[PDB]
Amino acid sequence: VDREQLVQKARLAEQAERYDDMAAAMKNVTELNEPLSNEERNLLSVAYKNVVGARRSSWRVISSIEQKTSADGNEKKIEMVRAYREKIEKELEAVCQDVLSLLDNYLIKNCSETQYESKVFYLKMKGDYYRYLAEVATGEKRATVVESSEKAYSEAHEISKEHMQPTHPIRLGLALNYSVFYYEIQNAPEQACHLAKTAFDDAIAELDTLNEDSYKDSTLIMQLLRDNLTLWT
């Protein structure tokens, strides 16, 4: 039940597609107050993303049912859909607050000044899981967590711009989700198009710097950046 065994369990849960156990195993490894390896860092992020992704997918389906049958006939059935939707939000908000707690207590705190890659990695997770909370929010509760995601992306944007190559996967992934936060959340298409094209052109300027070790990860995000830029114009 040591650190090596918990990572082995998280590897098994990913093979068994039991992402709930995978996120629970990597949560305990995070709670060991030790730095996370690049493999352990990716397994922790993949686990919670699939867990929160399952609740987001279920929420979009049920919320679409409410938008369709707003006041169509039976009102008691809408009460069942509303309580089912609010139960999904309670599970989604609990998973997000679980990730945001591990970041600001075990991951961001343990990051040194020289660990720029791990700092931008965890800062984008804070911006992502706060954006997911902004997806489920109304009134002041939305803008309260939107600014929490605005400060998480903008801070990582200033850090990853200086001490990181423009062709780095974490750099491109940060600019991708940041443009998504500017488009879907803030309804600012001009800010998203400019930010996406800026990181895209910055990556094109140094295409010769791609190493044979990790290049498909970089080309995939650049392809996603070009796809979103083509449909946003």
Binding site: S45, V46, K49, N50, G53, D128, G173, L176, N177, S179, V180, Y183, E184, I221, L224, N228
Partner: peptide, 8 residues
């Protein structure tokens, strides 16, 4: 589809 980077 989702415009964000999906974590495969």
């Amino acid at each position: 589809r989702k415009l964000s980077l999906q974590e495969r």
